[PDB]
């Protein structure tokens, strides 16, 4: 099933996770036919540890929609934010 979750990540000065995807992007390893932005890796001692996991789909960040966002715009937005970023993610959950 899926779960929508609000996550606060404090930049120090990075978020400590990697992403793939976006409109115009080269995809992702989770939902390959989906244009979304997905968390691909979370630094184990970084600011997102215990909060984000690979597979999490970013659908909003600091109130900006990440639904069907272009890849470069998504990257640049996440990099432009300062201090805390409030994410909305969609996480798949085991049956």
């Amino acid at each position: 099933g899926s779960m929508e979750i609000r996550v606060r990540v404090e930049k120090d000065p990075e978020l400590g996770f990697s992403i793939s995807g976006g409109v115009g992007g080269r995809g992702n390893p989770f939902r390959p036919d989906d244009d979304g932005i997905f968390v691909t890796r979370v630094q184990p001692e970084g600011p997102a540890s215990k909060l984000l996991q690979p597979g999490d789909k970013i659908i909003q960040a600091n109130g900006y929609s990440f639904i069907n966002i272009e890849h470069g715009q998504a990257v640049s937005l996440l990099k432009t934010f300062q201090n805390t970023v409030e994410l909305i993610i969609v996480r798949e959950v085991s049956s």
């Binding site: 990075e14 080269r26 995809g27």
Partner: peptide
């Protein structure tokens, strides 16, 4: 196809 290139932020 996706080939594993992700972007750290």
């Amino acid at each position: 196809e996706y080939l594993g290139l992700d972007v750290p932020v």
